[PDB]
Amino acid sequence: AMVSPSLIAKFEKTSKSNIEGTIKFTPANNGTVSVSVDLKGLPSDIGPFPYHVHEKPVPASKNCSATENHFNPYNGTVRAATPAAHAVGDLAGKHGNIMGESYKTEYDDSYISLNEKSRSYIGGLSIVIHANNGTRLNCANITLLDEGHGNANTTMS
Numbered sequence: 471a472m473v474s475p476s477l478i479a480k481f482e483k484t485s486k487s488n489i490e491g492t493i494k495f496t497p498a499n500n501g502t503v504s505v506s507v508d509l510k511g512l513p514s515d516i517g518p519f520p521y522h523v524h525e526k527p528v529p530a531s532k533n534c535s536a537t538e539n540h541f542n543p544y545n546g547t548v549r550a551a552t553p554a555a556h557a558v559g560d561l562a563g564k565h566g567n568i569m570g571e572s573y574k575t576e577y578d579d580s581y582i583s584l585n586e587k588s589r590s591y592i593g594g595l596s597i598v599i600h601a602n603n604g605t606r607l608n609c610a611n612i613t614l615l616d617e618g619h620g621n622a623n624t625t626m627s
């Protein structure tokens with residue numbers, strides 16, 4: 471039986487933002503994906519910080535505007551009364567905004583997919599972290615977590 475590969479988004483500190491850390495996505499139990507957030511350097515007083523999967527990659531320029539709109543294949547809404555009514559990539563709307571100067575949390579999401587054949591696939595997309603007023607503060611591409619794959623391989627970074 472096939473299992474889809476884990477993913478990661480690596481945020482780096484630059485003159486544009488002190489936010490740095492990672493969001494890891496790993497297959498979990500009962501058709502869910504475990505999301506592990508580990509971030510520091512957040513500008514707390516302009517949060518709390520929504521964060522979402524966006525539609526386009528972060529380009530080499532690191533312009534978070536270039537990630538364009540939210541990943542929302544099923545046309546969910548920004549506000550809702552049950553998790554499934556939010557966009558697939560609306561992680562903060564379903565699970566909580568990032569908050570504080572540092573934020574470390576783990577949770578399962580039952581909508582994002584690691585499977586490239588799924589309409590809910592998030593590989594190759596991006597994550598944007600926003601100030602509370604919507605300004606995009608930092609962003610990262612969603613890439614493979616492990617260097618080595620296949621049923622005859624090990625991984626050894």
Ligand SMILES: [Cu+]
Nearest residue numbers: 521522598600
């Ligand atoms: Cu966003």
